[PDB]
């Protein structure tokens, strides 16, 4: 058969990933421009939301050295690839869990609806890649929203998860943090309530 050049193989980001990708967390000085966890300036359109979560291993213990990258549509359902700290909105961001409490946070807006390749609307989602010590190749997941039940029910991506119970692992819970709209999205890498991870 036709064999292309092999892709460079993945390796763990390691426990010191923050040295390179989350400078503050390492305990180190930042540079003038950093890619971080604020995807929206306050004046960006759409519903401003706080996202947060914790990451658990197979023994139910916190993964305190997680590094997460996220990619999402703006409120109008458009992906903005021209990354610029001057932008009111960027579709890309990074976050990491505190070594103490193990919680990550993102500041963003709720993404608009985007169609799949066959023209079928997907429910509002944020694409997430999770890296850490002990994770050899990053895990892909999606965060959906519990206040989009009708859309979620019809999402052609959710509907590829064979067991309906597993779909629930990708639905973030709406709450309030300091009077402001928030969603919690915990990830369980392994075991009871294991989060669905994707290949594509």
């Amino acid at each position: 058969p036709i064999e292309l050049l092999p892709e460079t193989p993945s390796q763990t980001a390691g426990p010191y990933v923050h040295i390179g990708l989350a400078l503050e967390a390492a305990g180190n000085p930042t540079r003038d421009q950093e890619i971080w966890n604020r995807l929206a300036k306050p004046d960006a359109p759409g519903e401003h939301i706080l996202l947060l979560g914790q990451v658990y291993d197979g023994n139910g213990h916190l993964v305190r050295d997680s590094f997460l990258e996220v990619w999402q549509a703006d409120a109008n359902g458009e992906y903005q690839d021209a990354y610029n700290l001057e932008n009111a909105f960027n579709s890309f961001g990074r976050t990491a869990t505190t070594f103490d409490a193990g919680e990550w946070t993102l500041h963003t807006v709720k993404p608009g609806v985007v169609n799949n390749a066959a023209g079928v609307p997907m429910a509002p989602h944020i694409n997430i890649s999770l890296f850490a010590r002990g994770i050899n190749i990053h895990l892909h997941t999606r965060l959906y929203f519990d206040d989009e039940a009708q859309a979620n029910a019809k999402c052609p991506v959710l509907n590829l998860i064979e067991q309906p119970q597993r779909r629930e692992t990708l639905i973030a819970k709406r709450c309030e943090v300091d009077g402001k709209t928030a969603y919690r999205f915990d990830i369980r890498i392994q075991g009871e309530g294991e989060t669905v991870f994707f290949d594509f």
Partner: protein, 238 residues
Amino acid sequence: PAQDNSRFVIRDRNWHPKALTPDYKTSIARSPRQALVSIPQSISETTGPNFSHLGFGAHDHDLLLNFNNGGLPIGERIIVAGRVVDQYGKPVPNTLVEMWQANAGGRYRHKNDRYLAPLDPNFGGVGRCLTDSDGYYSFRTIKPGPHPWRNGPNDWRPAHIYFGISGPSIATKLITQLYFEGDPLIPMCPIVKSIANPEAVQQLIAKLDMNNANPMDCLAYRFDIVLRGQRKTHFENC
């Protein structure tokens, strides 16, 4: 905004390391036990950030000068350079390449590293750059020392530098580790050996590159990177 106009060759997850590789102990509790769920590529997977207008500092790619506290860092001066291409051999221009590493003694500048080898006051350990219009990148740094770690009772990482590469989409994004030609620690490392195929391991080994060295100044290593092949859509929805 971004558009869905391309598809990415599916990953070979037997070429990559598997999730569960128990000799690397931390992978036991941090690998899923359910199978990954395959989904078709959509605009969500086939687009990603472009960092052309990220503002880089003058020394962001130069670890001999980007943590300057009154001197040069101690250690083997090296250039690390190479090309980023996709599996079809197409160069990957204007892509973000980030790297980080321990100092010459295997000590990381991270609060959680308590290895007894000292920090170097003039070494930070992080760099970034974009590939040029032909897909080439380059960094200047010091060769990192091996790092012992609490896996087995006498486990030492080979000298290594972490690399993160964005590429054209979130589907291409990769973190990996570069190792150095001839390092006798490479065959012994349970992280290297998370990769089952010996030919894949060889792909992570940077080669001494005398041609790119500065005489009387610094040596050089070459580390090329291959990201998933990108092709146009064909015959979809018909």
